[PDB]
């Protein structure tokens, strides 16, 4: 007998090998997925007083330490984060219900206006100088030949009212680019940051539109504990406020439509 | 890691007998298997 066809050939067993390595892979990636946001929040944990920490399958991976350059620290993941109150109240006491923000929605710091507490220190260049700084601090930087200089354009909110005018431009010392617009606010002549991501240009007009917030809201932009640099904490606090206007800045972004 | 030396002597003891029990059930199954259906 020189013909006993074997039913299992190298392709079968190699597809088997694949699937096994695959399963181990999937599991592993799902473990890296829980280095943040975990263990979850249920009323299972609170009902049980905590004896039910929510983690699911697979489980959480041993902490990993990131050693920040420049006397920066040591970060871990997963870590234990202190709970933080919610600046809102349950739309329903029933589970899975959303919460309505407490007070003036843009002030709430809840919803599209929420944000975490990032360090109260600055991101740094390789050298260790504040990465994000204004062009006034970053002497060297310069507009690109043929690009309207933002400096001096008018910042205008979502309803067409002037907000202020661009008093300067913040830039990345690590990856040369416009990160922030500075706004000398009209209504109180105080200085605020405006993320580039929220700013639209109107070059022929030398304007800088903002669908995000209303001209007035520019008055409440979170502020810098120092005008020649900004902290990680402050970047989040700045952007999130503007983000809030996306759902709050009008009594209509709230939805529905019909 | 984080057991005293006494509880990994203990753990090793209980583990060892437990595993050997599994080896037992398996050897059981393999003998029945050899009986009903020789493969060699």
């Amino acid at each position: 007998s020189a013909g006993i066809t074997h039913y299992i050939d190298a392709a079968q067993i190699t597809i088997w090998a694949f699937w096994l390595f695959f399963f181990g892979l999937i599991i592993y990636l799902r473990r890296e997925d829980k280095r943040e946001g975990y263990p979850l929040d249920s009323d299972r944990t609170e009902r049980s007083g905590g004896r039910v920490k929510v983690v699911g399958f697979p489980d959480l991976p041993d902490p990993k330490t990131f050693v920040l350059p420049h006397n920066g620290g040591t970060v871990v993941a997963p870590r234990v984060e202190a709970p933080v109150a919610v600046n809102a109240t349950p739309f329903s006491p029933a589970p899975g219900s959303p919460l309505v923000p407490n007070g003036d929605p843009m002030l709430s710091g809840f919803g599209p206006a929420a944000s975490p507490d990032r360090p109260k220190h600055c991101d740094l260049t390789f050298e260790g100088l504040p990465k994000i700084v204004p062009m006034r601090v970053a002497k060297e930087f310069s507009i690109a030949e043929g690009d309207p200089d933002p400096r001096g354009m008018t910042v205008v909110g979502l309803d067409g009212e002037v907000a202020g005018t661009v008093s300067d431009v913040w830039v990345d010392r690590s990856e040369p680019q416009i990160r922030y617009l500075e706004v000398e606010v009209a209504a109180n002549k105080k200085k605020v940051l405006l993320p580039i991501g929220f700013s639209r240009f109107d070059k022929k007009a030398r304007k800088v539109k903002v669908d995000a917030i209303k001209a007035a809201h520019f008055a409440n932009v979170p502020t810098l504990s120092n005008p020649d640099q900004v902290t990680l904490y402050e970047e989040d606090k700045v952007c999130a406020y503007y983000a809030g206007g996306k759902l709050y800045a009008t009594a209509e972004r709230a939805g529905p439509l019909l | 890691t984080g057991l005293t030396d006494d509880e990994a002597k203990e753990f090793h003891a209980i583990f060892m007998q437990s595993m050997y029990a599994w080896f037992g059930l398996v050897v059981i199954a393999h003998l029945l298997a050899w009986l009903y259906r020789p493969w060699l």
């Binding site: 299992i8 088997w16 | 890691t1 030396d5 990994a8 753990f11 090793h12 583990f15 259906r37």
Partner: protein, 60 residues
């Protein structure tokens, strides 16, 4: 005189919870695996027609 005599200390180095769960999992998988491997070969115990053919409730 030999040395296999401090082979408990393994639970000071490799997490027991993990080694256990690892083993439990590994075995369940290996079981399903081998079962399928034999099932694709001659030693199959399903499609053998033993001891009373069920597709033979008639002339089969």
């Amino acid at each position: 005189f030999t040395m296999n005599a401090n082979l408990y200390k393994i639970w000071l180095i490799l997490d027991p919870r993990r080694v256990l769960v690892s083993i439990v999992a590994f075995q369940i998988v290996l079981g399903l695996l081998i079962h399928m491997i034999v099932l694709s070969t001659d030693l199959n115990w399903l499609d053998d027609n033993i001891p009373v053919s069920y597709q033979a409730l008639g002339k089969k």
